[PDB]
Design an enzyme around this catalytic site. Structure first.
Site, PDB file in Angstrom:
ATOM      1  N   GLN A   1      -1.161   7.618  -6.367  1.00  0.00           N
ATOM      2  CA  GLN A   1      -1.133   8.274  -5.064  1.00  0.00           C
ATOM      3  C   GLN A   1       0.194   8.992  -4.838  1.00  0.00           C
ATOM      4  OE1 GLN A   1      -1.778   9.404  -1.614  1.00  0.00           O
ATOM      5  NE2 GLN A   1      -3.222   9.926  -3.250  1.00  0.00           N
TER       6      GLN A   1
ATOM      7  N   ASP B   1       0.866  -1.161   0.000  1.00  0.00           N
ATOM      8  CA  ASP B   1       0.000   0.000   0.000  1.00  0.00           C
ATOM      9  C   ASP B   1       0.915   1.227   0.000  1.00  0.00           C
ATOM     10  OD1 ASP B   1      -0.121   0.907   3.274  1.00  0.00           O
ATOM     11  OD2 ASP B   1       0.582  -1.118   2.754  1.00  0.00           O
TER      12      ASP B   1
ATOM     13  N   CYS C   1      -8.021  -1.734  -5.139  1.00  0.00           N
ATOM     14  CA  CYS C   1      -7.253  -2.026  -3.936  1.00  0.00           C
ATOM     15  C   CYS C   1      -8.043  -1.680  -2.678  1.00  0.00           C
ATOM     16  CB  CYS C   1      -5.926  -1.263  -3.950  1.00  0.00           C
ATOM     17  SG  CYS C   1      -6.031   0.406  -4.639  1.00  0.00           S
ATOM     18  N   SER C   2      -7.600  -0.645  -1.972  1.00  0.00           N
ATOM     19  CA  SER C   2      -8.266  -0.208  -0.751  1.00  0.00           C
ATOM     20  C   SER C   2      -9.178   0.985  -1.018  1.00  0.00           C
ATOM     21  CB  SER C   2      -7.237   0.146   0.323  1.00  0.00           C
ATOM     22  OG  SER C   2      -7.807   0.074   1.619  1.00  0.00           O
ATOM     23  N   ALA C   3      -8.593   2.071  -1.512  1.00  0.00           N
ATOM     24  CA  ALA C   3      -9.357   3.275  -1.836  1.00  0.00           C
ATOM     25  C   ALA C   3      -9.790   3.278  -3.307  1.00  0.00           C
ATOM     26  CB  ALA C   3      -8.524   4.517  -1.552  1.00  0.00           C
ATOM     27  N   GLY C   4      -9.180   2.408  -4.111  1.00  0.00           N
ATOM     28  CA  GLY C   4      -9.521   2.332  -5.520  1.00  0.00           C
ATOM     29  C   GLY C   4      -8.957   3.458  -6.366  1.00  0.00           C
ATOM     30  N   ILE C   5      -7.813   4.005  -5.968  1.00  0.00           N
ATOM     31  CA  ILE C   5      -7.204   5.090  -6.731  1.00  0.00           C
ATOM     32  C   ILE C   5      -5.687   5.036  -6.841  1.00  0.00           C
ATOM     33  CG2 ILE C   5      -9.087   6.694  -6.266  1.00  0.00           C
ATOM     34  CD1 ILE C   5      -7.357   8.008  -4.138  1.00  0.00           C
ATOM     35  N   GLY C   6      -5.009   4.606  -5.782  1.00  0.00           N
ATOM     36  CA  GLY C   6      -3.558   4.554  -5.799  1.00  0.00           C
ATOM     37  C   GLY C   6      -3.002   3.429  -6.647  1.00  0.00           C
ATOM     38  N   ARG C   7      -3.035   2.220  -6.095  1.00  0.00           N
ATOM     39  CA  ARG C   7      -2.555   1.064  -6.825  1.00  0.00           C
ATOM     40  C   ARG C   7      -3.447   0.794  -8.046  1.00  0.00           C
ATOM     41  NH1 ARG C   7      -1.711  -2.702  -1.518  1.00  0.00           N
ATOM     42  NH2 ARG C   7      -3.430  -1.305  -0.929  1.00  0.00           N
ATOM     43  N   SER C   8      -4.763   0.913  -7.884  1.00  0.00           N
ATOM     44  CA  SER C   8      -5.688   0.703  -8.995  1.00  0.00           C
ATOM     45  C   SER C   8      -5.369   1.648 -10.157  1.00  0.00           C
ATOM     46  CB  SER C   8      -7.130   0.941  -8.546  1.00  0.00           C
ATOM     47  OG  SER C   8      -7.555  -0.039  -7.608  1.00  0.00           O
TER      48      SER C   8
END
Ligand SMILES: O=C(O)COc1c(C(=O)O)sc(-c2cccc(NC3CCN(S(=O)(=O)Cc4ccccc4)CC3)c2)c1Br
EC number: 3.1.3.48
Length: 297
Positions: A261, A180, A214-221
């Site tokens: 991110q 993350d 992923c978690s927030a749906g913006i960084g890794r995604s």
């Protein structure tokens, strides 16, 4: 051109500056629905919401809200659904969206628990004997099989619309080693995973858009989708020089905020695309090299 530009930014240290410019120019659209009082418990993060114009609407008169956006890349001609990791009360919604949008594949770039936090509910069955039933959206999910690798797992699932007794196979691609706020181990391991998604047919235009989270749906995604879109554009024209990564990244941000991110995630995007171009332009051996380098066994 991305390779001279990458060497340029690297040589200076302006990845922070470069990255910040994207935040400064990114599109800023209203997220009214997502901020409505009744949807407070439907968002994992107060500062990460889908724009109203591109949000996925659930097909139910009660409440049609889910924290997911439809990133429609007109020029590249490929769509994704980028969504947050499902909450304990939104797994039903999550699968309703998968079903209504006719998605064939689901990509998970995070682990349920990271740095001590529960980044995502356990929305899929872990053992064939114990299928899952979502009473609220009337769907059943069964684990059919799974292929576990060193850093990612591919699960074959069956989603049944309990109402119509209709059945569909959903491929689940779980990248387990992408930290993350971090980047993959290497461009090779990332591209190996991506091509696994590509080869499954989940990104085909004959299915609904692939769901990426992923978690927030913006960084890794965001990193995953940007790299895929860039390689596709490049592929469509067989001309890596015509692809402006930042421009396409900006274009993605019109459909969902905050895609990518960190400055290093962006640096890695360049890295991945540059390496992936080898394949796009004819190199038939890189694919296997990536497989070897990734150490999936
Ligand atoms: O997967 C990963 O790598 C990390 O995943 C994660 C998380 C995790 O896994 O824990 S939490 C998180 C997060 C949560 C709340 C706010 C922000 N960051 C803010 C930064 C500023 N932006 S923005 O979109 O640039 C603001 C803006 C909106 C429209 C127009 C211009 C600026 C919103 C999110 C980031 C991210 Br992403």
């Amino acid at each position: 051109e991305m390779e001279k530009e990458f060497e340029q930014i690297d040589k200076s240290g302006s990845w922070a500056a470069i990255y910040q410019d994207i935040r400064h120019e990114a599109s800023d659209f209203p997220c009214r629905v997502a901020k409505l009082p009744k949807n407070k418990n439907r968002n994992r993060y107060r500062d990460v919401s889908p724009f109203d114009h591109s949000r996925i609407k659930l097909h139910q008169e009660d409440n049609d809200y889910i924290n997911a956006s439809l990133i429609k890349m007109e020029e590249a001609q490929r769509s994704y659904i980028l969504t947050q990791g499902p909450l304990p009360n939104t797994c039903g919604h999550f699968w309703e969206m998968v079903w209504e949008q006719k998605s064939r594949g689901v990509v998970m770039l995070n682990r349920v628990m990271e740095k001590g936090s529960l980044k995502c509910a356990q929305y899929w069955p872990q053992k064939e004997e114990k299928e899952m039933i979502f009473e609220d959206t009337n769907l059943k999910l069964t684990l059919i099989s799974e292929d576990i690798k060193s850093y990612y797992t591919v699960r074959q699932l069956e989603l049944e619309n309990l109402t119509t007794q209709e059945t569909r196979e959903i491929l689940h691609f779980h990248y387990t080693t992408w930290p993350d706020f971090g980047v993959p181990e290497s461009p090779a391991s990332f591209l190996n995973f991506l091509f696994k998604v590509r080869e499954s047919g989940s990104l085909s235009p004959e299915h609904g858009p692939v769901v990426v989270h992923c978690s927030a749906g913006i960084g890794r995604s965001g990193t995953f989708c940007l790299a895929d879109t860039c390689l596709l554009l490049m592929d469509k024209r067989k001309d890596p020089s015509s692809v402006d990564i930042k421009k396409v990244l900006l274009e993605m941000r019109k459909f969902r905020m905050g895609l990518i991110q960190t400055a290093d995630q962006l640096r890695f995007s360049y890295l991945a695309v540059i390496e992936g171009a080898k394949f796009i332009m004819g190199d038939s051996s890189v694919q296997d090299q990536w497989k070897e380098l990734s150490h999936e066994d």
